[PDB]
């Protein structure tokens, strides 16, 4: 319908620092999306300070 899934918690977002990630249950698809103004593989640096 729109986005009914399971959002990936802190605790298990050790895969990305400031990203969120979005596990699929019913069909398994574990995908990790960074913030957008975000820099760094592990998504530790960052484009915007204020």
Same mark, same amino acid.
């Given at each position: 319908? %729109? #986005?009914? $899934?399971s959002r990936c918690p802190?605790?298990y977002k050790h895969y @990305?620092? %400031?990203?969120? !990630?979005? $596990?699929? /249950?019913?069909?398994?698809?574990?995908? @990790? /999306? @960074?913030?957008? #103004?975000?820099? #760094?593989?592990? !998504?530790?640096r960052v484009d915007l $300070?204020?």
């Amino acid at each position: 319908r %729109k #986005g009914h $899934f399971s959002r990936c918690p802190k605790q298990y977002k050790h895969y @990305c620092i %400031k990203g969120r !990630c979005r $596990f699929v /249950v019913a069909e398994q698809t574990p995908s @990790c /999306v @960074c913030d957008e #103004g975000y820099i #760094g593989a592990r !998504c530790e640096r960052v484009d915007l $300070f204020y």
